[PDB]
Design a protein around this ligand. Structure first.
Ligand SMILES: [Mg+2]
Ligand SMILES: [Zn+2]
Ligand SMILES: [Zn+2]
Ligand SMILES: [Zn+2]
Lengths: 96, 157, 97, 171, 540, 107, 280, 183, 85, 103
RNA sequence: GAGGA
């Protein structure tokens, strides 16, 4: 996305979102015209993942833990979720 | 393909711009250059009218003249003129007119009659190898008849 | 603001056709799309800036048009296709008879 | 292949040209954009006959742009390739897998698999030509080219020529 | 703007409808969708050659849409297709399917009631393919056998055979002879052997709508633009509702293929078949009566296609028959007795925003130069210069703002100015009168102000009402306005052939008092009153 | 013209179209006790000959389908006894012009 | 709803109103060709009143004494008395008028003399008068033949349709019937000379103007009368604020009206709330 | 002042009539989600930030907040919040493009769950203008529609001058006798 | 077929307001596009004003075509059209 | 007679309130309701299942089902009506958009 | 939700 006229390799441009345009702040040429606003079970191996999710969720409830902690634990489980270094471990050790 | 299989735009019923049916008209290397230069004559004729208020050299020296007459960017037309002179082998339009009258007598579809004029061969078999259209529509002997008649007219100008 | 349908009708009763069109196209969402002259659908793969159009499926490459329509209309047609109805768009009165 | 054709064209005439002499610019543009142009539907449009009697009937003003729309009918001559057809020609440049034969206004290419086996390619030669058991076929050589394939793309027709058959190669 | 194209420009004149040949669908598609994995190729949130652009529409502001590439914003989005394991109904047509099957041999496929029957002989001759089919189905709704041969006795290819009493459940058709659920594929073939003629003789068309097309076997996949991906958070992008529905249909179809090639517990097959059929069904219509609603992980049902169009802000009534437009403004109105009847007092800041594109001619080039000199702030100024070839230039960012020299045929987007006609309506609008044209008078003080007699047509009062104003963008648009929709033209309304305007409250009340017989006016006040009349010739 | 006072054996009804080209028409007697066409609201209907019909169709440049219609069963259609395809001319007093003539084709 | 139904009914250049498929709805817009904005109530002065009053107003007799007009108002008033070449004309046009009286009395049954019509004659009359300050003491400079033939030719010039075949001609004749009745009522010779007393030159001005305005008042082809009518019916319905029925005053007619009754009409409903049947 | 409302005394407005305060609160917090996706409050720069709001970041301090008492306007950012790309893009919160005013009081606290999160309140005075709407206590909606200085208004012999003129045509149609009686 | 002879044009000799409107629109549009002008402007600058003048003295040589319902048409040109309005 | 009565009824309704509407408007409406030879209501299942354009009928009510019937009957819609031209965003053959000057 | 009218 570059100004044909001004032609600076890092293009100093501005987005006049209120007009929905994109402008070469140097020469003033408009570059793009319409700015799209945007602002407003077994076939997947997530079966074990969701079992872990449900147990994790109920445990988070029991602990009264923040949703951020719940998400962090879910993400950590997803990060491992399978390994020889895991090798089973009762599926509750990994939850904890 | 080359077996008389041409699109809608190249059917027999070539409706002239007056809105009526007419026969398909094709051009070989026996009329193309001899009509193009003639039309260029009219072109230059109006070009100077409204302005008021061997064959090789006759090809290109006048090609540049009508390049002056035309818009000149049509040098590919000049390529076609060159291709004509190199492989269009008729002159004195009455020559080719007798040829075409004979080919009208042949009862041949105009595509085939153009095939004959365009090609310069020796036997009916050479034609059948080049023109699968022209293999049996007439006696192969008559093919060689008219090929020989062409060779009689086959004089380089 | 919304140029509601009752506005459309008022603007009709005035007979101001040109204005109505302007509102509905240049004011909002004019969109240009190519069209197969045979299949009558929007499938033309207009490799523009090469003039290569090639509605395969009809394997056309020559008989092709571009039109201007509201984008929402193009969208509507694509939705109809997705629902399996083909709204073929033909740019001439179908009088072969 | 050459044909006399009657073609219809629609020409848009921008308003500024609305003099008493519109037909001047009209015929002007007609020639400027019809003679010597390529169509996927008619082939290269070579020359136009009857420069005078051209049906120029009546304009239409597009509802916006105010530019008049004219439907010119005119009669001209076009050059159209066809598959399986036999032509003459001459090469322009070379390719590693064949050579491009300039059949007049258009250039027809012949590919490596499209040539007889004895016709081999010499890259060392200048210009790199194609050497048969009996023919060394060079840039200016006269090749009897047979039209095998044709591209019907609008504005650009491409033709596939081949000399694998008899009566081909040198004319 | 959009690039040049060499294609001819035309205007559609006919819309030919009709159903989709699965053959055509395959001919059209540019990719066969296989995996409901959407875009993340398990990582690297680029996109899989699976669903969602195996080259069928650019989404991320990069051209590369299957060699058309078009940028975004230009690609129509090119369709893709999906092959169904087992054919299914098409929700919309199920009733027509049942009606049809009640009228054709369940084996030979010929019409039940045909032909020498006289009522049939009538029905054939009748037009209104809908009504013709109605009559026929009325006839053969009662026929039960396949009518070997006919009375004078005559013979027809009737493979005489009793054909059941079909009936509909859920998305299935049940039929009793003298019982069994009628499968899909059977009916598919049955249709495939109807004729080339009779289905027409009951409504269908040969080339565009053959009944077997009423049941889907291949499936078209509307490209992304029909179902764009909202990135409502900035690391992940919530997918369009339809895309979930498609994932579901694809999942089920995958499953059915699995259950077929990998051993067929013969009646889990139906358990998955009906699932797939249901999925497609609710996908094209989530509001089937006597049904669950296909919910989506939230409780909110899925917004099927059919509901995308259903009236009152479907596509049609909400985006086509009426839309939301640029070059318009809306504000509170306020009366004013010093405005000419057709004037309107657009407040200055508005006029600083709406624009009108002039064309640079020798007649104005100087004046337009002055405007563009003024830049986009000081009022009588402009905001954009549109050089030819349509490359707008914003004036806010031209350091050389006064420098540029307009070339004839360029366009300048001047601010609104006085006497530019604009349109004016006050919704609801039950009148041609509710929209009229006006000359602009630019004033301070943000309300729209407008003469007082003009209230009755708009049926407005200044108790906080607001009205919108529309700015024509081109010469004949504004010509249209000033010559057809201008106010004074509307004084006499065709509705009742009496004027639709008139003098109103304050003035109406005063003018009576002034004109009483008792009234007399001394000199000085007389002089002032006279001078108030703009056209007073100057004679006392 | 067959006038029956009570009803028809529907079998007998089957024999109405028996004998082309001639036609037979039935009227319940009760329906004839009062001529409708004398009513205030019924304008003068005039059946017009075929050449007239061509003339018309030409002047307005119509196809038959573009005329306003009238059911064959319509009471005054019966009273006149039109045939599917005849066009009748209707003259009615119009408060805007006094006399206004309109045509309906007998669907 | 209404708008949708009549959405696309336009007046086409043959002054006939067709929908989109071209089906003809009315053979002339509103059975007169006249645009609505150019109507206004005017009174037909032949339909009402006593027979004797009518006669006295219109009758003129060059031979008998009674309805003989006093010669003073006419330049040629003297010698005319007893003439025949003109007496015949008077008889003819008077017969014309009585025919109109009968005709109208059978069109408008009650005798409502006022009806919206195109061009307002009366204003043209007085504009003529003022524009020529017609002194009411000089004898008029007209004659009879000028008068009567003027009105006839005028009637010839009120074109609505411009075909060349008797179908179109009958259409025109009908289209302009009623307005011509008005015209003849208003420009009857006796009335002109007696009351309006125009000059010849004034009179010609009047004729010219009438024709011009009439032609000015014909609907313009291309006019979307469909939508027009839809709105013009719907909007007043909205203005029925007290909508349902106000027949609390008389339960003898608790008969539907207003919006409920209208809505009942449009969806043609077999079960009217109050099916009634008046009998005379 | 006809066809409702009315004329309001301009000078009397200057005295303070019908003035009012307007307070608007903008809320925002740190990241809702993303273990590493962690939105932070601070003053962004061109540190491959690539989503500058084009407004005016100069107001706020390093903690991406504006000290209360600062005047703001237009779409000046009031909360500088940036998101990692895992350089980091801007997710600030400019105030409404239409309005302007003073930052009144800025409150910083942690969410229920422990997320730092911030509330901002902007103060603004709104003076009656030509179009603003007013109403008696009965039914008479009305908006202003011109303001006269004091002298121009009619004045009675005692020198009193109304600050509000409403047109008599309002009364009879509506029959708001109670309005008169209250007056 | 499909046009109509110049005689046996049965439409109205006058010009409908819609015609006048579109005509002025088109002519103005053209003028703005530096089309030639057939009349002496007297400092006229507003293209609509100009077009109104041209029309006033019948100097607008313009193209669109009428249409009977069937599909035929007549051609008038602004000269022959009485601009009463 | 049905048509005349219909007009009388409508007129009664409207003049009941005392307001008055020009004749030709009521006449036109009534005539539309009686071309087909029978009293065609103005409901969806009335006029709207005439044989007019598919799109025009689809915009009033029952949009999608209308489209279904159309796509089955292979219906041909000719874009002459207004609503179609709206949907295509073309100049409808209306008022300004239907006529003649030619050069 | 809000909601003015
Ligand atoms: Mg209000
Ligand atoms: Zn630049
Ligand atoms: Zn195609
Ligand atoms: Zn059978």
């Amino acid at each position: 996305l570059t100004c044909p006229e001004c032609k600076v390799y890092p293009p100093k441009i501005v987005e006049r979102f209120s007009e929905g345009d994109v402008v070469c702040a140097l020469c003033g040429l408009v570059l793009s015209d319409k700015l799209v606003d945007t602002r407003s079970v077994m076939d997947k191996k997530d079966n074990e993942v969701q079992a872990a999710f449900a147990k994790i969720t109920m445990l988070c409830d029991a602990a009264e833990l923040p949703k951020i902690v719940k998400d962090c634990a879910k993400e950590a489980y997803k990060l491992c979720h399978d390994e020889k270094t895991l090798k089973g471990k009762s599926m509750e050790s990994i939850m904890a | 393909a080359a077996t008389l299989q041409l699109g809608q735009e190249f059917q027999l019923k070539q409706i002239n711009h007056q809105g009526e049916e007419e026969e398909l008209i094709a051009l070989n290397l026996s009329e193309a250059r001899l009509v193009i230069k003639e039309a260029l004559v009219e072109r230059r004729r109006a070009f100077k009218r409204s302005q008021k208020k061997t064959r090789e050299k006759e090809l290109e020296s006048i090609d540049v003249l009508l390049e002056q007459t035309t818009g000149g960017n049509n040098k590919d037309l000049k390529n076609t003129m060159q291709y004509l002179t190199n492989f269009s082998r008729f002159r004195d339009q009455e020559t080719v007119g007798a040829v075409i009258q004979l080919l009208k007598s042949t009862g041949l579809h105009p595509f085939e009659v153009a095939q004959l004029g365009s090609l310069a061969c020796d036997t009916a078999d050479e034609a059948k190898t080049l023109i699968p259209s022209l293999n049996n529509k007439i006696s192969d002997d008559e093919l060689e008849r008219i090929l020989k008649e062409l060779s009689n007219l086959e004089t380089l100008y | 603001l919304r140029f509601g349908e009752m506005e459309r009708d008022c603007m009709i009763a005035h007979g101001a056709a040109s204005f109505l069109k302007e509102r509905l196209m240049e004011a909002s969402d004019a969109f240009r799309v190519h069209i197969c002259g045979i299949c009558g659908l929007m499938t033309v793969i207009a490799k523009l800036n090469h003039n290569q159009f090639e509605c395969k499926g009809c394997d056309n490459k020559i008989d092709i048009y571009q039109i201007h329509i509201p984008y929402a209309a193009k969208l509507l047609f694509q939705e109809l296709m997705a629902m399996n109805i083909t709204p073929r768009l033909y740019t001439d009165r179908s009088r072969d008879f | 292949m050459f044909f006399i054709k009657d073609l219809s064209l629609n020409i848009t005439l921008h308003p500024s040209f609305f003099g008493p002499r519109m037909k001047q610019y009209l015929k002007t543009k007609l020639l400027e954009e019809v003679e010597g142009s390529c169509t996927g539907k008619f082939g290269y449009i070579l020359c136009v006959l009857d420069y005078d009697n051209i049906d120029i009937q009546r304009g239409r003003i597009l509802p916006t742009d105010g530019s008049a729309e004219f439907n010119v009918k005119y009669r001209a001559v076009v050059f159209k390739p066809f598959k399986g057809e036999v032509v003459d020609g001459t090469v322009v440049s070379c390719s590693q897998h064949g050579f491009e034969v300039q059949v007049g206004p258009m250039k027809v290419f012949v590919t490596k698999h499209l040539m007889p086996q004895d016709l081999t390619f010499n890259a060392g030669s200048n210009p790199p030509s194609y050497q048969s058991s009996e023919d060394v076929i060079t840039i200016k050589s006269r090749i009897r080219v047979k039209i095998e394939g044709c591209i019907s793309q609008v504005s650009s027709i491409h033709a596939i020529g081949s000399i694998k058959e008899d009566y081909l190669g040198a004319i | 703007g959009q690039q040049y194209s060499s294609a001819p420009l035309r205007t559609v004149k006919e819309v030919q409808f009709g159903l989709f040949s699965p053959e055509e669908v395959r001919a059209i598609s540019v990719a066969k969708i296989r995996f409901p994995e959407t875009m993340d190729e398990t990582q690297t949130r680029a996109k899989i050659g699976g669903l969602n652009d195996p080259r069928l529409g650019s989404i991320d502001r990069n051209l590369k849409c299957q060699t058309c590439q078009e940028g975004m914003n230009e690609c129509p989005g090119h369709f893709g297709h999906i092959d169904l394991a087992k054919p299914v109904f098409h929700v919309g047509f199920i009733a027509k399917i049942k009606k049809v099957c009640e009228c054709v041999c369940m084996h030979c496929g010929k019409l039940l009631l045909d032909e020498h029957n006289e009522l049939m002989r009538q029905a054939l001759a009748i037009k209104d393919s809908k009504k013709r089919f109605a009559a026929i189905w009325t006839l053969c709704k009662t026929k039960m056998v396949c009518e070997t041969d006919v009375p004078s006795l005559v013979s027809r290819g009737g493979c005489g055979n009793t054909q059941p009493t079909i009936r509909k459940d859920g998305l299935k058709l049940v039929g009793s002879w003298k019982l069994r659920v009628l499968s899909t594929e059977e009916i598919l073939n049955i249709f495939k052997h109807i004729s080339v003629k009779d289905f027409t003789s009951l409504g269908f068309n040969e080339v565009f709508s053959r009944p077997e097309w009423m049941i889907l076997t291949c499936l078209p996949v509307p490209p992304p633009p029909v179902r764009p991906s909202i990135s409502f958070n900035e690391s992940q992008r919530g997918e369009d509702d339809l895309t979930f529905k498609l994932a579901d249909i694809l999942k089920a179809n995958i499953s059915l293929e699995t259950l077929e090639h990998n051993g067929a517990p013969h009646h889990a097959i139906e358990e998955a078949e009906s699932l797939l059929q249901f999925h497609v069904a609710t996908y094209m219509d989530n509001d089937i009566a006597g049904q669950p609603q296909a919910l989506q992980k939230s409780g909110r049902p899925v917004k099927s296609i059919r509901a995308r169009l259903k009236g009152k802000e479907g596509r049609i009534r909400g985006n086509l028959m009426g839309k939301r437009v640029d070059f318009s403004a809306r504000t509170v109105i306020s009366g004013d007795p010093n405005l000419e009847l057709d004037q309107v007092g657009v407040p200055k800041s508005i006029a600083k925003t709406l624009t009108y594109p002039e064309v640079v001619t020798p007649y104005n080039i100087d004046r337009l130069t002055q405007l563009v000199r003024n830049g986009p702030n000081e009022h009588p100024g402009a905001k954009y210069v549109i050089r030819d070839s349509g490359d707008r230039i914003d004036l806010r960012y031209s350091k050389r703002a006064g420098d540029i020299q307009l070339q004839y045929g360029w366009k300048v987007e001047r601010h609104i100015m006085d006497n530019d006609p604009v349109l004016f309506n006050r919704q609801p609008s039950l009148h041609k009168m509710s929209m009229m044209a006006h000359r602009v008078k630019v004033i301070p003080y943000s309300t729209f102000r407008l003469n007082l007699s003009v209230t009755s047509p708009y049926n407005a009062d200044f108790d906080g009402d607001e009205m919108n104003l529309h700015v024509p963008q081109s010469e004949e648009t504004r010509a249209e306005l000033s010559q057809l929709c201008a106010v004074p033209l509307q004084i006499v309304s065709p509705q009742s052939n009496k004027p639709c305007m008139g003098i109103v409250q304050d003035t109406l009340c005063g003018i009576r008092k002034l004109t009483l017989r008792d009234t007399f006016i001394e000199l000085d006040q007389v002089l002032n009153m006279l001078y108030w009349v703009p056209d007073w010739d100057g004679v006392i | 013209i067959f006038v029956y006072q009570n009803n028809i054996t529907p079998s007998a009804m089957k024999l109405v179209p028996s004998i082309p080209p001639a036609t037979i028409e039935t009227f319940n007697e009760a329906a004839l006790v009062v001529n409708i066409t004398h009513h205030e609201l019924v304008p003068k209907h005039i059946r017009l000959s075929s050449d007239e019909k061509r003339e018309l169709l030409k002047r307005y440049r119509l196809k038959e389908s573009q005329l306003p219609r009238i059911q064959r069963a319509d009471p005054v259609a019966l009273y006149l006894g039109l045939k599917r395809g005849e066009v009748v001319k209707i003259i009615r007093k119009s408060e805007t012009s006094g006399r206004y003539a309109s045509y309906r084709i007998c669907m | 709803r209404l708008v949708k139904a009549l959405e696309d009914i336009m007046v086409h250049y043959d002054n006939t109103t067709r929908n989109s498929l071209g089906n003809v709805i009315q053979f002339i817009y509103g059975e007169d060709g006249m645009d609505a904005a150019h109507i206004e109530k005017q009174s037909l002065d032949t339909i009402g009143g006593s027979d004797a009053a009518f006669e006295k107003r219109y009758r003129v007799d060059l031979l008998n004494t009674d309805h003989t007009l006093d010669p003073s108002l006419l330049e040629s008033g003297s010698e005319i008395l007893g003439d025949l070449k003109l007496q015949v004309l008077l008889d003819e046009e008077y017969k014309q008028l009585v025919k109109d009286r009968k005709f109208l009395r059978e069109v408008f049954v009650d005798g409502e003399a006022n009806w919206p019509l195109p061009v307002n004659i009366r204003r043209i009359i007085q504009n003529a008068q003022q524009t020529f300050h017609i002194d009411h003491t000089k004898p008029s400079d007209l004659t009879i033949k000028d008068i009567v033939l003027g009105v006839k030719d005028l009637q010839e010039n009120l074109l609505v349709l411009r075909g060349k075949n008797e179908i179109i001609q009958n259409a025109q004749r009908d289209a302009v019937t009623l307005f011509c009745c008005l015209l003849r009522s208003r420009l009857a010779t006796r009335r002109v000379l007696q009351e309006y007393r125009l000059t010849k030159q004034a009179f010609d001005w009047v004729l010219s103007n009438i024709e011009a305005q009439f032609l000015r008042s014909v609907v313009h082809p291309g006019e979307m009368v469909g939508v027009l009518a839809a709105q013009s019916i719907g909007e007043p319905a909205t203005q029925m604020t007290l909508n349902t029925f106000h027949f609390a005053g008389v339960a003898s007619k608790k008969v539907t009206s207003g919006v409920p009754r209208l809505k009942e009409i449009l969806n043609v409903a077999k079960n009217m709330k109050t099916p009634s049947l008046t009998v005379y | 002042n006809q066809e409702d409302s009315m004329i309001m005394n301009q000078s009397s407005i200057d005295r303070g009539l019908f003035r009012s305060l307007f307070f608007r609160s903008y809320m925002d917090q740190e990241k809702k989600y993303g273990m590493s996706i962690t939105e932070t409050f601070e003053k962004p720069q061109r540190t491959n930030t690539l989503r500058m709001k084009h407004g005016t970041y100069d107001k706020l301090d390093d903690d991406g907040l504006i000290a209360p008492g600062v005047r703001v306007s237009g779409e000046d950012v009031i909360i500088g919040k940036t998101t990692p790309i895992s350089s980091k893009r801007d997710a600030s919160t400019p105030l409404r493009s239409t309005e302007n005013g003073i930052v009144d009081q800025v409150l910083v606290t942690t969410n229920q769950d422990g997320l730092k999160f911030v509330k901002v309140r902007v103060r603004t005075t709104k003076i009656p203008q030509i179009g603003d709407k007013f109403a008696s206590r009965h039914g008479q909606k009305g908006t202003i529609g011109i303001t006269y200085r004091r002298e121009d208004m009619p004045f009675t012999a005692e020198g009193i001058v109304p600050d509000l003129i409403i047109n008599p045509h309002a009364i009879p149609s509506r029959m708001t006798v109670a309005h008169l009686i209250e007056c | 077929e499909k046009a109509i002879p110049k005689d046996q044009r049965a439409t109205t000799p006058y010009m409908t307001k819609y015609e006048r409107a579109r005509i002025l629109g088109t002519r103005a549009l053209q003028i703005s596009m530096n089309a030639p002008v057939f009349v002496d402007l007297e400092g006229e600058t507003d293209p609509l004003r100009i077009a109104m003048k041209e029309l006033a003295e019948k100097k607008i040589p313009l193209v669109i075509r009428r249409y009977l319902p069937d599909g035929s048409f007549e051609d008038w040109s602004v000269e022959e059209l009485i601009v009463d309005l | 007679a049905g048509r005349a009565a219909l007009y009388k009824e409508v007129y009664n309704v409207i003049a009941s309130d005392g307001s008055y509407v020009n004749y030709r408007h009521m006449a036109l409406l009534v005539d539309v309701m009686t071309t087909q030879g029978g009293l065609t209501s103005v409901t969806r299942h009335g006029f709207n299942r005439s044989n007019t354009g598919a799109l025009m009928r689809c915009s009033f009510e029952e949009t999608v089902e209308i489209l279904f019937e159309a796509g089955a009957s292979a219906e041909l819609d000719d874009c002459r009506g207004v609503s179609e031209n709206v949907i295509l965003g073309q100049m409808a053959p209306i008022g300004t958009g239907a006529f003649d000057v030619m050069i």
